[PDB]
Design a protein around this ligand. Sequence first.
Ligand SMILES: [Zn+2]
Length: 257
Amino acid sequence: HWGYGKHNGPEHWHKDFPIAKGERQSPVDIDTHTAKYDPSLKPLSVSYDQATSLRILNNGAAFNVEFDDSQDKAVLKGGPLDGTYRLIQFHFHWGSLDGQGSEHTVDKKKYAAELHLVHWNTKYGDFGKAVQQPDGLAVLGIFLKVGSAKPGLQKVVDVLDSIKTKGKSADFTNFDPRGLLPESLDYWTYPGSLTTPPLLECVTWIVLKEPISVSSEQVLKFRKLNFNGEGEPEELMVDNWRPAQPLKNRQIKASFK
Ligand SMILES: [Zn+2]
């Protein structure tokens, strides 16, 4: 099955998922000089005050913090979006070393990690129907650099020991994702895809310009997770990022000058 090893990594995914070579694949390099300011773009509206986290799961590709999405509790609206998108989960991608780990890049710069807050368009009723639509998902991407600790991340870091291996989960209630946001909500946006199989071309990407800072110790703990299941040879969950894909016939728009 697909993964991030030498034998099953991103360069192999097209054999099972031919859309991997499609016209609107993610992630991409964000060339800052070519992204054009679009004065028609609105401020992003991030409404997470009533977010209800439930569980954290190691799915063998990353860890997901899952939310109750049975009602409009934590929603993303505005920005480039038409309509209301409900938060279902967040997860990260990260590297074996601080100099790599992000999926998007900025003028070819790789950050240490990248947070994806995944939201689905409520007009399609459920996540499964949403991923079949070109405007079905909105993913808020936030870069992580290593420096000062991010206090609002520590609760996530501290539970990781309990979900070391694929298939493990732990209760994870009352987590406030507002603690993972940077100060500014300035962003780039473009149409793209899921960055893991099935690689569906159903995502409006919104990537924040301002990275958050996390400490070396925080990200070191990410790197102690495992891709493997319990009792299997240990494969550290590191370098779980898909590299940048061709931009093709797309324009990246900036919300800021
Ligand atoms: Zn992701």
